Amino acid sequence: KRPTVRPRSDVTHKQLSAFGEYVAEILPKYVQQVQVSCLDELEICIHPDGVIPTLTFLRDHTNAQFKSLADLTAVDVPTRQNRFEIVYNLLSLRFNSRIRVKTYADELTPIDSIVSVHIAANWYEREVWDMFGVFFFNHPDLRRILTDYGFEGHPFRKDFPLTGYVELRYDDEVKRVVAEPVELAQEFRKFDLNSPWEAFPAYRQPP
Amino acid sequence: PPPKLPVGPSHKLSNNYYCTRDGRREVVPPSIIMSSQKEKKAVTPAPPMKRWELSKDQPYL
Amino acid sequence: AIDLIAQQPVNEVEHRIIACDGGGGALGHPKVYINLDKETKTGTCGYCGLQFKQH
Amino acid sequence: SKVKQDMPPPGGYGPIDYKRNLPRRGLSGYSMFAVGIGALIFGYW
Amino acid sequence: TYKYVNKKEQESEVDMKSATDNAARILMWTELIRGLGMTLSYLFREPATINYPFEKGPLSPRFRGEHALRRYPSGEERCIACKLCEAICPAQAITIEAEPRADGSRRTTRYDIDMTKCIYCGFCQEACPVDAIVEGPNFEFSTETHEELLYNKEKLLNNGDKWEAEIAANIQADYLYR
Amino acid sequence: KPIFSRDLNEAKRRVRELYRAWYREVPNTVHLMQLDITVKQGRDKVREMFMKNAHVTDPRVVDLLVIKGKMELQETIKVWKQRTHVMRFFHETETPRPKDFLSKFYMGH
Amino acid sequence: EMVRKCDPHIGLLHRGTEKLIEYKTYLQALPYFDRLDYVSMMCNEQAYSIAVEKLLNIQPPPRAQWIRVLFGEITRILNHIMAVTTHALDIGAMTPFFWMFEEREKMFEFYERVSGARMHAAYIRPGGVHQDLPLGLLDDIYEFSKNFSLRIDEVEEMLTNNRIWRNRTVDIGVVTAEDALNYGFSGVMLRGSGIQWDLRKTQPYDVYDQVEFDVPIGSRGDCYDRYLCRVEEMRQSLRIIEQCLNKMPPGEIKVDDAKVSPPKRAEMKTSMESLIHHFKLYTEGYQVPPGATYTAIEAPKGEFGVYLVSDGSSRPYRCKIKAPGFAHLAGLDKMSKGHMLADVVAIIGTQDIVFGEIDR
Amino acid sequence: GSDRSRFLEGKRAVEDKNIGPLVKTIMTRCIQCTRCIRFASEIAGVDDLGTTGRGNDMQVGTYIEKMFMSELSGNVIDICPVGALTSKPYAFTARPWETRKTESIDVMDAVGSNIVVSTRTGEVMRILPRMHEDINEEWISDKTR
Amino acid sequence: LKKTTGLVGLAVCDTPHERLTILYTKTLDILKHFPKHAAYRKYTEQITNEKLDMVKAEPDVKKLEALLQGGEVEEVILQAEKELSLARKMLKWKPWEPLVEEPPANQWKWPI
Ligand SMILES: CCCCCCCCCCCCCCCCCC(=O)OC[C@H](COP(=O)(O)OCCN)OC(=O)CCCCCCCCCCCCCCCCC
Ligand code: SF4
Ligand code: SF4
Ligand code: SF4
Ligand code: SF4
Ligand SMILES: [Zn+2]
Secondary structure, eight states: OOTTSOOOOOHHHHHHHHHHHHHHHHOTTTEEEEEEOTTOOEEEEEOGGGHHHHHHHHHHOTTOOOOEEEEEEEEEOSSSSSOEEEEEEEEETTTTEEEEEEEEEBTTBOEEOGGGTOTTHHHHHHHHHHHTOOOEETOSSOOOSSSOTTOOSOTTSTTSOTTOSOEEEEETTTTEEEEEOOOOSSOOOOOOOOOSSOOOGGGOOOO | OOOBOOOOTTOOSSSOOGGGTOSGGGOOOOEEEEESOOOOOOOOSSSOOOOOOBOSSSOBO | OHHHHHSSOOEEESSSEEEEOOSSSTTSOOOEEEEOOOSSSOEEOTTTOOEEEEO | OOOBOOOOOTTOOOOOOOSOOOOOOOOOSHHHHHHHHHHHHHHHO | OEEESSOOOOOOOOOHHHHHHHHHHHHHTHHHHHHHHHHHHHHTSOOOOOOGGGOOOOOOTTOOOSEEEOBOTTSOBOOOOOOHHHHHOTTOOEEEEEEEOTTSOEEEEEEEEBTTTOOOOOHHHHHOTTSOEEEOSOOOOOOSSGGGGBOOHHHHHHHHHHHHHHHHHHHHHHTTTO | OOSSOSSHHHHHHHHHHHHHHHHHHHHHHHHHTTOSSOHHHHHHHHHHHHHHTOSOOOHHHHHHHHHHHHHHHHHHHTTOSOHHHHGGGGOTTOOOOOOSHHHHTTSOO | OEEOOOOOOOOTTOOOHHHHHTTSOTTTTHHHHHHHTSSSHHHHHHHHHHHHHHHHTOOOOHHHHHHHHHHHHHHHHHHHHHHHHHHHHHHSOOHHHHHHHHHHHHHHHHHHHHHSSSSOOOOEETTEESSOOOTTHHHHHHHHHHHHHHHHHHHHHHHSSOHHHHHHHTTSSOOOHHHHHHHTOOTHHHHTTTOOOOHHHHSOOTTTTSSOOOEEEOSSOSHHHHHHHHHHHHHHHHHHHHHHHHTOOOSOSBOSOTTTSOOOHHHHHHOHHHHHHHHHHHHTOOOOOSEEEEEEEOOSSSOEEEEEEEOSSSSOSEEEEEOHHHHHHHTHHHHHTTEEHHHHHHHHHHHOOOHHHHHO | OOSSOOOOSOOOOOOOOOOOSSEEEOTTSOOOOOHHHHHHHTTSOOOOOOEESSSTTOEESOSSOOOOOOTTTTHHHHHOSSTTEEESTTTTSOOTTTOBOOEEEOOSSTTOOEEEEEESSSSEEEEEEOOOTTTTSSOOOTTTO | OOSOOSSTTOOOOSOHHHHHHHHHHHHHHHHTTSOTTOHHHHHHHHHHHHHHHHHHHOOSHHHHHHHHTSSSHHHHHHHHHHHHHHHHHHHHHOTTSOOSSOOOTTTTOOOO
């Protein structure tokens, strides 16, 4: 057809939409939204209270045996009222398909811990707490996992500066690796490379 | 030896308008199905995966 | 640099406009055409600085 | 000037051996023990 | 398509010959002897090492190494302050400060590459529209002092002068692919 | 929609428990880490760190602070954090930068 | 000397790649991916390329697809050599490491000949590949492949049936199938214990759906089974390389959309529009349409994935990297229950963990 | 725009007139849009610039050798879309991605003209109009710029 | 009788038909206590009745597995147990209720 345009299929789109209605009506209490992307990836957005019910159902229900958790990502959009967006990616081997379950959280609004459901989350949620700062209830052992032992901050927050508030060096006076306020040599050079023109007119929001 | 490399499909002087092959501009927004803003049969995410067929090249190693 | 672009010839081209590459062909600089209608000076190629005259 | 680009040879490359070739050695067993027993008896005597 | 890698199949086959073979295997250390034989076989094979200082290994024309700034045959720095090299360098190692010349020409007055920040990626040499910045064949430029790894326009141009021949050859032999 | 403690009155109990724990731990740290500080210095620094967050009034933020402090105490009990990290609280290499305008006008801005 | 608890402390090699990427265009972020799993480079950058192509709604050209699969198999061989040989070196056996690193060096020579770098090539780029294979590289790959089988067979004659190796691995790190799935394992951490899963088969990408290759599966679920699985995977990689070499097609190597991939230098030097495209691509970069995706590949270790969120700018909005080994090193404790320090040292190897990817 | 070039001929070339110390005139890279002429005739009322000839060889410039100086002369650089008219001082002293862009006010003129004073790592590189409808209205003085 | 199941830790079941009938009947019993309108009740009853009918229909274990579409009959049994437990939990989670609280203004909006 077209050499430089990805091949387009509709069977998977249809099956994923049908399963979207499936889940949407099997869990009315929690599901707030459902969508299927042009990439054909099912995306169910649910109330945070419903993470445990939704994922337990998605793991156990015979028609949906989502027995693997690919990842527990978090995104940070600072304008919306709840900055943090938790994204549980799921895999089902029996039906050879993936799903995405999303919810929202704030600096002071924990999300239940799915460690009971998938033990694979034990470290993913620790990472989310370490970086974005979303607290998780009933996590068996919640700690920092990727940051410094005495670290103060939440690096993946958008507002957090890239280079942090502290740098380390060896001070031959005290004979220790001390911590000092950061002082770069050539500060990070941002670039203004956003063109004045709008590229993709499907997303032009009207007033 | 000095190579001479082939050209791509869109090395055409006619019928080569970019609007007829712009893959980027075909990305529509996601298709909502159920939204708070706005007897049936059981359905699976997709047809169940068949069973893998044991190979014949060297069946048992 | 300056002395080495100072020490060279001023090339002749019989046409009104002359194309410039770096001189390597496809190993030089993007082709640019310099117009040699001014007669009080010589056309200087922006990329490589070579100078052209009309005769 | 035709195109001269990296290509497999006409007719394709030769077949490749990509499978285990660990052989099975011929050594018996009764022989293995008989050699030892013969040596032991000789040394004993 | 799957193949079992270690599934035990038929078990009832017990024989006197099989049993004496198994006992010989256990007692005589047959498989261990076989491994020892393999090691000896290697002992009697030509070594794969190379006397490095007087015998450097092969490198292709695409090899990315110490940077250099090229010149035109007339002797002029190709650097026209594109600035694309600085814009594309993922690690932000290039620093350019350019000013108009006394000849009404565009040139660079501060061209610095921090070779302790460069990732040797080739994005500069491929985003240079006049083939000024290149990554020459050299791969031995270790220095004792850090400050000697912060390069400048001069050091780059002297590297270009030194390696112009090999840079020229590699570009000549590769430009068709690029 | 409280984190753990419903009210500030409930939260201060947890805060005081955390302080009890840190006070009881300081001797053990100073001894088993071979820090060159007096146990009094350690306890005073614990007090100072607690006081640094005294202004907070929101029950949920008090709870979050308690959680972070309890994690830090765990990190020190388990001796995961080393001396190089524990001493970082003391700011022993810092030279207090002046505060009055007459002098800051003189060092930069 | 019995291990009663394992508490893997990581983060000692975390350098905030996920946040750094958010500040760099889509082309300027590719080199990071070559460093996330420094053992298997081209597979990581293949994951990135497939994700960005998915968002761009463009398709790589056929020759680029075949080249990417070929070099992905070479990278899989590199990863399996590293895993097996370092595992053996830590367990005790040392000669196979030296034996096989010569072939690793030869594969590095191929890497360099094609990309100009012995690792961290950055060869695979969203759109296809940076440059076409230099003439003769297929011939050299054939010469290497036709012989690699004998070298792997020598390593096997060393390790496969040795009683010491069998005693040192067998019935160690035994993980049940359900427990593995729940723990989130992937790749051989799954196929070793009988689970019939392999993304290259189940959800093909590139041209993995045109080459026949078997997927080894283990029955016991222990270290010895997984070592056998890795060796068989190397053999199947040789199979796939043979097929790719025989079916390498002619044509372009990068998507012929000059608004995504750079135009050829001659075109840049003699075309106005091509020069504009070069300028903007290497300054601003492409503008990826808004969206989100989670691309997954069967990286030589497991299931390397990228969750990429784009807001229509030329820089990604969020790039979570799902590293295969994260869940594995999480499940270390479960695997190590009731084992000695030596058994644990063995167990860590089977995971085949690179902390570049673990830390991201 | 398209992705490729089907133009397989040579390109037009033009002479670079002298217009003064302020506005360098690399005229070959002119799209001949007459924004410069319209500004000269309307905003500044100087009536210097104009279009000569007909067809491709049409040239936008003073067909004598006048120097188009005005209190508003410098704005031609801003209005011209493609880099035909450029600033003699700011030649090749920076690139738009590099530079920082901070808004301020002009004090050189008593008018009150608003300004953007773009700087690139400690050095102010250029001064450019900042649109204020009432005061400036996208135009500043040559002195200020 | 199957000597082994490929999966590690999942052991062979001697009485697969009996175990399956038992589990499916238990699921169908626990479902009765859901509200008759529950989408979960409707769908799970359809599913369970289908599989129960297949088990009753086919004696041979190989053909039963092929009909069921679940790899090993032991895996299918395990899944039946999981479904039963899921029903037990659903009875208390009452997912059939209306939405708990609608999302904020543009919580699920993108690109922002
Ligand atoms: C006539 C009337 C009287 C007749 C009398 C007849 C007597 C017959 C006696 C035959 C027995 C010979 C003695 C053999 C001793 C070996 C003991 C043995 O059976 O092997 C044990 C062990 C194998 O391991 P494993 O599989 O665990 O065995 C137990 C299985 N449940 O084996 C091992 O320990 C191997 C692990 C250690 C490997 C060490 C590396 C050695 C490398 C090879 C050395 C070869 C040269 C040795 C000779 C040196 C001479 C100076
Ligand atoms: S290195 Fe190349 S692109 Fe960069 S300023 Fe010099 S000539 Fe221009
Ligand atoms: S090779 Fe890459 S990192 Fe190094 S200077 Fe060039 S663009 Fe920058
Ligand atoms: S404004 Fe610029 S592009 Fe337009 S006609 Fe004048 S010089 Fe040419
Ligand atoms: S940047 Fe614009 S005005 Fe300048 S040469 Fe390119 S196309 Fe012409
Ligand atoms: Zn020139």
